[PDB]
Amino acid sequence: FACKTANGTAIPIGGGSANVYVNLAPVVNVGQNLVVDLSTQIFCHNDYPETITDYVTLQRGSAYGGVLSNFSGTVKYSGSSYPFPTTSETPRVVYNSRTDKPWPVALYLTPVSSAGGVAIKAGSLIAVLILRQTNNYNSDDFQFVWNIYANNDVVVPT
Numbered sequence: 001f002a003c004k005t006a007n008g009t010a011i012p013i014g015g016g017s018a019n020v021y022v023n024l025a026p027v028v029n030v031g032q033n034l035v036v037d038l039s040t041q042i043f044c045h046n047d048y049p050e051t052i053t054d055y056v057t058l059q060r061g062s063a064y065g066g067v068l069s070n071f072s073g074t075v076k077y078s079g080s081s082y083p084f085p086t087t088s089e090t091p092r093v094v095y096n097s098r099t100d101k102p103w104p105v106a107l108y109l110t111p112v113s114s115a116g117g118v119a120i121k122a123g124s125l126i127a128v129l130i131l132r133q134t135n136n137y138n139s140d141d142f143q144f145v146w147n148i149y150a151n152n153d154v155v156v157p158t
C-alpha cells in the first residue's frame with residue numbers, strides 16, 4: 001500500500017509524510033462553502049490485492065492558520081460528513097485494487113461571522129490530514145501524513 005499526489009509526490013509502503021499544495025476559490029462569501037476536494041490530488045493503491053485487503057481511514061484532520069481562525073469546517077469522507085477539525089477516526093474505506101483510487105476526502109469550509117478580508121494567506125498551512133492504513137494480513141498500522149498548503153489568498157468579502 002502506498003500513496004501519491006497528482007504532481008507525483010509519493011509516500012511509500014510504511015507511510016511517511018508529504019506536502020499537498022491546493023488551489024482555492026479566491027473569493028468566498030459568508031454563507032458559502034470553500035471546498036477543498038483532496039480526491040483530485042491524493043491517490044492510493046493496494047500492492048497485493050491477490051492476498052490482502054487494505055483498510056484506510058481518516059484518522060485525524062486538524063485545521064491551521066486561517067482555516068482554524070476564520071472557518072467552520074466539515075469533512076466528507078467516502079460520502080459521509082463529520083466535524084472538521086475531527087472528533088473521531090472515520091470508518092474504513094477498503095482498498096482492494098492495484099489501480100490507483102482517490103482518497104475520498106473533501107473539506108467544506110464556510111466563513112465564520114467574524115471572518116473578513118484575507119481569511120487564508122497564500123503559502124500557509126491550512127490542514128494536516130492523517131491517513132491510517134491497516135490490513136487483514138498482518139499487524140501493519142501506518143500513517144500517511146498529508147500537510148495541506150494554500151496556493152493562493154482567499155478573501156472573504158466584508
Ligand SMILES: CO[C@H]1O[C@H](CO)[C@@H](O)[C@H](O)[C@@H]1O
Binds near residue numbers: 013045052134135
Ligand atoms: C506487501 O505489503 C505491503 O503491501 C500491502 C498491500 O497493499 C500492505 O497491506 C502492507 O501494509 C504493505 O504496504
